[PDB]
Amino acid sequence: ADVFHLGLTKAMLDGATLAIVPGDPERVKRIAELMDNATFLASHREYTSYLAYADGKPVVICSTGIGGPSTSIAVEELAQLGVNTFLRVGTTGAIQPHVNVGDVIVTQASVRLDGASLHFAPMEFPAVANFECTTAMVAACRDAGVEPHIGVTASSDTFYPGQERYDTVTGRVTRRFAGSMKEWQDMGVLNYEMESATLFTMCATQGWRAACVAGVIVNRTQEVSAVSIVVAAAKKLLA
Amino acid sequence: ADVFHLGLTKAMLDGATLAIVPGDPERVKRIAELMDNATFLASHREYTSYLAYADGKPVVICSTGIGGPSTSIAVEELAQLGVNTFLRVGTTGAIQPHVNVGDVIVTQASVRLDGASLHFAPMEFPAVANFECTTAMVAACRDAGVEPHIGVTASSDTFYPGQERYDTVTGRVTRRFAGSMKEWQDMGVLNYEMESATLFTMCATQGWRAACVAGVIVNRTQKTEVSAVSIVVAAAKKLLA
Amino acid sequence: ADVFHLGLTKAMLDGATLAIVPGDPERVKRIAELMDNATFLASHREYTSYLAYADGKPVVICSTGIGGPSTSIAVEELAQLGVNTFLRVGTTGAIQPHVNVGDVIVTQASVRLDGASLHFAPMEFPAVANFECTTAMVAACRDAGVEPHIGVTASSDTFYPGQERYDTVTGRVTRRFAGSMKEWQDMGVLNYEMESATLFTMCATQGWRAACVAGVIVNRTQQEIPVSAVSIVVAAAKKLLA
Amino acid sequence: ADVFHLGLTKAMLDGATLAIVPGDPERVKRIAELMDNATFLASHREYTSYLAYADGKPVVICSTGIGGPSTSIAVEELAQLGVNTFLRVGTTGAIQPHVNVGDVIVTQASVRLDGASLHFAPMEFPAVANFECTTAMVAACRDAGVEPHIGVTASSDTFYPGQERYDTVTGRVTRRFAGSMKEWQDMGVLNYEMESATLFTMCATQGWRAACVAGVIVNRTQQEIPDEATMKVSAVSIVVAAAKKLLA
Amino acid sequence: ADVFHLGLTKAMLDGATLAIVPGDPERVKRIAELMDNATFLASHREYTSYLAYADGKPVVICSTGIGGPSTSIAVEELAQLGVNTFLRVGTTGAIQPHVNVGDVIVTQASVRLDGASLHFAPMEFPAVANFECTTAMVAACRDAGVEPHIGVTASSDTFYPGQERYDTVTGRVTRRFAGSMKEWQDMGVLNYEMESATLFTMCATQGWRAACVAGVIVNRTQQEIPDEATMKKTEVSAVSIVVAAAKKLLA
Amino acid sequence: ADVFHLGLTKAMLDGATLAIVPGDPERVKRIAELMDNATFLASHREYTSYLAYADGKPVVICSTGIGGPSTSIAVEELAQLGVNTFLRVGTTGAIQPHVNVGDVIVTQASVRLDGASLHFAPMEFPAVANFECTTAMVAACRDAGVEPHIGVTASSDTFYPGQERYDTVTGRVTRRFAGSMKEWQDMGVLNYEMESATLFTMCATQGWRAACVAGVIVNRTQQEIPEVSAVSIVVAAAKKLLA
Numbered sequence A: 001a002d003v004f005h006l007g008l009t010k011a012m013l014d015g016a017t018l019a020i021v022p023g024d025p026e027r028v029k030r031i032a033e034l035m036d037n038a039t040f041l042a043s044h045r046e047y048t049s050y051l052a053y054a055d056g057k058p059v060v061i062c063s064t065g066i067g068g069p070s071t072s073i074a075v076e077e078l079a080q081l082g083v084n085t086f087l088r089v090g091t092t093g094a095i096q097p098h099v100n101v102g103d104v105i106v107t108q109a110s111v112r113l114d115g116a117s118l119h120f121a122p123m124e125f126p127a128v129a130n131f132e133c134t135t136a137m138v139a140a141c142r143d144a145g146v147e148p149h150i151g152v153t154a155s156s157d158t159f160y161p162g163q164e165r166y167d168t169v170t171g172r173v174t175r176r177f178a179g180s181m182k183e184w185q186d187m188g189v190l191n192y193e194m195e196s197a198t199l200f201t202m203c204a205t206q207g208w209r210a211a212c213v214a215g216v217i218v219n220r221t222q223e224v225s226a227v228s229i230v231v232a233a234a235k236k237l238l239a
Numbered sequence B: 001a002d003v004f005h006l007g008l009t010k011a012m013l014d015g016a017t018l019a020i021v022p023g024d025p026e027r028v029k030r031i032a033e034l035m036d037n038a039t040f041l042a043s044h045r046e047y048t049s050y051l052a053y054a055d056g057k058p059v060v061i062c063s064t065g066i067g068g069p070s071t072s073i074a075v076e077e078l079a080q081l082g083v084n085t086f087l088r089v090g091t092t093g094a095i096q097p098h099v100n101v102g103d104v105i106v107t108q109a110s111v112r113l114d115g116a117s118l119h120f121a122p123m124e125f126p127a128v129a130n131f132e133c134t135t136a137m138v139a140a141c142r143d144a145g146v147e148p149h150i151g152v153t154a155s156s157d158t159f160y161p162g163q164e165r166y167d168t169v170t171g172r173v174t175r176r177f178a179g180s181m182k183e184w185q186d187m188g189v190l191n192y193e194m195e196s197a198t199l200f201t202m203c204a205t206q207g208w209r210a211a212c213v214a215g216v217i218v219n220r221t222q223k224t225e226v227s228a229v230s231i232v233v234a235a236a237k238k239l240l241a
Numbered sequence C: 001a002d003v004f005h006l007g008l009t010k011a012m013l014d015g016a017t018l019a020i021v022p023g024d025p026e027r028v029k030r031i032a033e034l035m036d037n038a039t040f041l042a043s044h045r046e047y048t049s050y051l052a053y054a055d056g057k058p059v060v061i062c063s064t065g066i067g068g069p070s071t072s073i074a075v076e077e078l079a080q081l082g083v084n085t086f087l088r089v090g091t092t093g094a095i096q097p098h099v100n101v102g103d104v105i106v107t108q109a110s111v112r113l114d115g116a117s118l119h120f121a122p123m124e125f126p127a128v129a130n131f132e133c134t135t136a137m138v139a140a141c142r143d144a145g146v147e148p149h150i151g152v153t154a155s156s157d158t159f160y161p162g163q164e165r166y167d168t169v170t171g172r173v174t175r176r177f178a179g180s181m182k183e184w185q186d187m188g189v190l191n192y193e194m195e196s197a198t199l200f201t202m203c204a205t206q207g208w209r210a211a212c213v214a215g216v217i218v219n220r221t222q223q224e225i226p227v228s229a230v231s232i233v234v235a236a237a238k239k240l241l242a
Numbered sequence D: 001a002d003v004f005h006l007g008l009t010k011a012m013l014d015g016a017t018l019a020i021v022p023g024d025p026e027r028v029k030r031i032a033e034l035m036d037n038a039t040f041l042a043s044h045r046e047y048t049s050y051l052a053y054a055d056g057k058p059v060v061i062c063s064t065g066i067g068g069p070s071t072s073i074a075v076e077e078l079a080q081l082g083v084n085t086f087l088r089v090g091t092t093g094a095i096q097p098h099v100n101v102g103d104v105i106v107t108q109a110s111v112r113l114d115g116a117s118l119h120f121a122p123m124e125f126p127a128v129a130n131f132e133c134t135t136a137m138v139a140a141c142r143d144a145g146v147e148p149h150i151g152v153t154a155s156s157d158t159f160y161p162g163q164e165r166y167d168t169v170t171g172r173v174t175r176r177f178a179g180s181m182k183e184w185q186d187m188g189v190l191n192y193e194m195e196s197a198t199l200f201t202m203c204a205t206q207g208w209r210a211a212c213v214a215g216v217i218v219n220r221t222q223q224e225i226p227d228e229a230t231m232k233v234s235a236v237s238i239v240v241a242a243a244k245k246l247l248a
Numbered sequence E: 001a002d003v004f005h006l007g008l009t010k011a012m013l014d015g016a017t018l019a020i021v022p023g024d025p026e027r028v029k030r031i032a033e034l035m036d037n038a039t040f041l042a043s044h045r046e047y048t049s050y051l052a053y054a055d056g057k058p059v060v061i062c063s064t065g066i067g068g069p070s071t072s073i074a075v076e077e078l079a080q081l082g083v084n085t086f087l088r089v090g091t092t093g094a095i096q097p098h099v100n101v102g103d104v105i106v107t108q109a110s111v112r113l114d115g116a117s118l119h120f121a122p123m124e125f126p127a128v129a130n131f132e133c134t135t136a137m138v139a140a141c142r143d144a145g146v147e148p149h150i151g152v153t154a155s156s157d158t159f160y161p162g163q164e165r166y167d168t169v170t171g172r173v174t175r176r177f178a179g180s181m182k183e184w185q186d187m188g189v190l191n192y193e194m195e196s197a198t199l200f201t202m203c204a205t206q207g208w209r210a211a212c213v214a215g216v217i218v219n220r221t222q223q224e225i226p227d228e229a230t231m232k233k234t235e236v237s238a239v240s241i242v243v244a245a246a247k248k249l250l251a
Numbered sequence F: 001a002d003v004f005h006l007g008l009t010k011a012m013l014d015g016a017t018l019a020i021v022p023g024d025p026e027r028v029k030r031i032a033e034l035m036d037n038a039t040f041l042a043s044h045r046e047y048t049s050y051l052a053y054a055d056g057k058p059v060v061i062c063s064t065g066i067g068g069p070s071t072s073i074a075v076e077e078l079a080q081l082g083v084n085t086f087l088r089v090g091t092t093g094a095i096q097p098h099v100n101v102g103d104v105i106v107t108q109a110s111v112r113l114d115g116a117s118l119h120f121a122p123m124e125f126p127a128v129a130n131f132e133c134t135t136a137m138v139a140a141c142r143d144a145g146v147e148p149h150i151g152v153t154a155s156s157d158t159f160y161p162g163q164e165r166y167d168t169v170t171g172r173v174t175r176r177f178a179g180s181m182k183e184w185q186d187m188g189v190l191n192y193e194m195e196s197a198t199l200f201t202m203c204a205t206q207g208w209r210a211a212c213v214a215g216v217i218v219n220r221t222q223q224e225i226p227e228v229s230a231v232s233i234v235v236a237a238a239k240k241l242l243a
């Protein structure tokens, strides 16, 4: 290993400069296999990595785990190995009535309901995706005949209280987050997830490109496509 | 009038749903005359408003004044009259050595060094432009042969201490803003201006589209006005097509 | 010009050290004509400036525009030209049912609902008026046989949600400002306007004098949407220059 | 008693509506004795209280103890008993180089370096004195041939790190307060004390009047704490003169 | 004196390194007299100090006054004179419905509702007691047959609005503290007092040991303030407990 | 499964009310096999769980993953299945020079350099361990001849800038965190890790007991980059609490 967590060496990446970063270690192989010559690199903790080839060029695929702290480790260590572009593919719950189950959201920027983003910039800095990569994701969507919801995502350090879920052992939500779902809804926020605010703030401040695409699993008011889009998006950027 | 500061009624706008929003009232007529049948609407305080037509569609041109507070009045009152799209055009000073004078900046999102943004959403919320409008701005630049710098802008409630200027009467910068220019520079921030954080945050939270383009007039580390006004007019056309 | 925005030089001020600073550029002329030898100086963006004379002494009258960001520019640049005293004259919405439309409010200190103030001092610092200048404003009221309604003013970076106005496109206010008008009311706060927190914090921190009088144009216990003040601020200037 | 800490009943105040509030319980009798018919009311914890008469009018003198939390109990319980005006008389450290030992400072408003003020209003609210009472203090100074320093005071929950004293066991100050004396200095701030931010904020928000005069005991551009080398009209005489004016 | 407020010199402490710090100057004598050869030292402002001897070792007993800012001066000045261990003994309003009047509460850590603690470390730092001293307090309670209530305590710069008391002149509490009592109750917080946040944060950051035990004088689910109807105090005594804890630590 | 992420039902836990919670999924088996009848329950995402018995008492062993957010899911979902005590066993970097690589730290309470703790209580609430469980951990060290460093831990949402590591791509640390290591050192804080502030705040507010022991793998006074001691202690501690 040349990096402490991932178990990777710069040579293992074969000059890859772009990473696809799902949350789940168990989804990394299946993403890798949509491209050419997929090969297992390593597995440690929540970090499962593969290499594969998109229209000739190496792409590393590596899981992040759930949440900003585990994401910030993967992104830093990948970047130590020469990665400069991070495409997140994921799952999400929608909070707008017009965002249907099975739909696709491309996150342009995020509400910072996380703590790791503050380890890169004070809260005034916007958690904003790279314009070129977001453009690539949108065009990959439309190629698939899917018009994506493009907008703001609430990115939370918790799955329960910070997404204002009451279906828990205590049934309690702290004052800060009580009433919060309706607040984001009113402001046009599309969905909740748990990594984009760290991912975006850290890449913007450090000089790397990031974007995020997600298939909607649930809608709080009432996913092959997503992986196929992110691979299409990667090939656009590498072309 | 329908609206208390602008002195406008809805009928006056002839169905316009898109405003170009420069900072200076004296630049309003100038922008309006790039389009057809420019016509004075009203002038009160720092708010001068014209109607013109862009490829046959009605467009409002209205000044905001300097800063978020005056901007927030213009945008709300225009939106009361059916405007839903706000395109900001201006001049700016760059903080990155490779952003030369005569370059163009398209602001994708802003550092919130302002107060009025917080009257729309808590600080966690991003001060981000509409993707569709930002896309139009960038296409408008490229049609004119300009590759814009697209990125993050620091949006300040002050021209002097919030932009870490020491060329003032006291020469003092309060602790919060001491060393702050270097901090934004290291984060890739491109420039300082004084309205985008308010404009972006209020539009994103209230359901309106916003974007911002500016020509670089000075670089803190080291024709362009006409260029930026030309670009915003071309983006308006694209959006209304 | 000797300064970046105003279009003025030090010589144009004829040695004035005191400015009257209305919000509205369209009020500067009226103010100046209450004094002697009123002379147009400049007009750029929201900054219209006149000079006039009070009992032989030059006074500059210059607008700030609406809100702290434009105010911070006018104040700094006039201070560049030797002004050290800034008497704001404005309009205001009363929030206490005892204050009537047409009454005058002298702002001793302000709730900092603005952002420019923080570019001069952290929030713990009081947005407080100069004692001598406030004193002069209160006296000018007494001479005119009017109540000066002296107290605390909420100074907001917005006219709409930060003053908890609901007759708007979306009809909503963000959480921070929902209920906020009732909170200031209960705390005895008199009124809303949009410049005094920035003006006071900047003058206090930078060694300049400031004060603020405003005419009440609406009472918010009744409704959201809406010369005395101007004669008082002129009277006060004269007292300070005597 | 009819309040929980001070040990007082409304009848004990003989209709007083104005209090003089020093920090030290050991100063209360001396202040009371500048007035007429000084009489002990109670003493419990740090709260010593006297009644006396100012040009025929009743006045309660009651100590606050050091800091906003103890002050807030005093001011609330007095106000339960019908007090509506609170004149603090204190001691202070000057932070500007020519505000001398023995001078008096009249505090117009305060930097809120306390926690108790936040239990009355969010930090955006100014910790400002009552205009009427501040004017009377200024007037009482001038009558005595003292021109007071009138301005802004830094009002601190600590005597040591929050006033940037370093002659302490660890000799360290936490990051927030490191360099903070220079920031207040540059801003024209006159002095440090430890009660005015809480007193002013609680009074403005609750509808009571308040003011603050204090004598300088040290100049911090010179010394951290006074000693026998430090220089030798009292603030106590000024506050009693001010009270007479307000109740006339 | 060697210090600016307390009126004490190093010699007067006779080498003492442990202080009992009650909030009230009027309790100091009584505490002192539970030990040997109790002797008055000094009294200035809110600071009354005695010396006594616990199994032959010197113990200083000094009041803090109400609230963190007064507490902070006493703790600093005592440490200037060689004290390194501070055992707070106080009174407290229980906020859980079956923590009864007359029970003892050993505070292990504190909600920081004060401002003096921020003068020692940013709010993210925990206001936590010394493990050894808390252990001695718990042990002193059990020796005495009292199972203490060990947990978290809300430590407030005010007695009225910050403890959500409404029986006041205005009968209003600012937005931040409206509904706050219910918030702490839901989180399992046991009680309110007014010193432990400041004392714990300053001691942890400066390298000194602190602990806090307090007797319950009201239950806030019952009454805002106690009266003659309130349960009367039992022979269970927080002052006896603190003295017994001191002895364990000095042994 | 009766919970959304862990893949568990209540019946699978055999009545267990205490969990040992390491950060690494690969550590779960190793911990379980220090106990009796180690039994695989589930593996999903970063969440690997075993059941085992501690002197006859059932105990769940479930990874949290790195960081508060993943920790918060595991703690909540276990508690839905009847777990009420959470003993974290981890690794840590020491920031005090007297702490050696290989020593154990028992965390009494944590500096909240995390964001998930704020999803349970505002920042004034102390990130403090359960007194009983901390005392059991101290006793287990003592029974094993190891002196626990008991104190305050800085618990950070990042491994790099928030622990003021400079050997990174950009080698920059944001203003808030520049000089922070020295600040903590000066305040007597022992060590950095990445889960305790979330764990402690969420348990204390929710009515559950939590404690945390970690083995020192690096001393930051010397360098930035670096079971079975720590794990032995947490198992011994579990036995104490369920007796």
Ligand SMILES: O=c1ccn([C@@H]2O[C@H](CO)[C@@H](O)[C@H]2O)c(=O)[nH]1
Pocket (backbone or CB within 6 Å): B005, C023, C065, C066, C067, C090, C091, C092, C093, C094, C159, C163, C192, C193, C194, C195, C217, C218
């Ligand atoms: O309710 C009101 C009425 C007037 N103003 C003042 O008048 C201008 C807006 O009409 C602003 O400069 C502000 O100073 C208010 O803030 N609120």
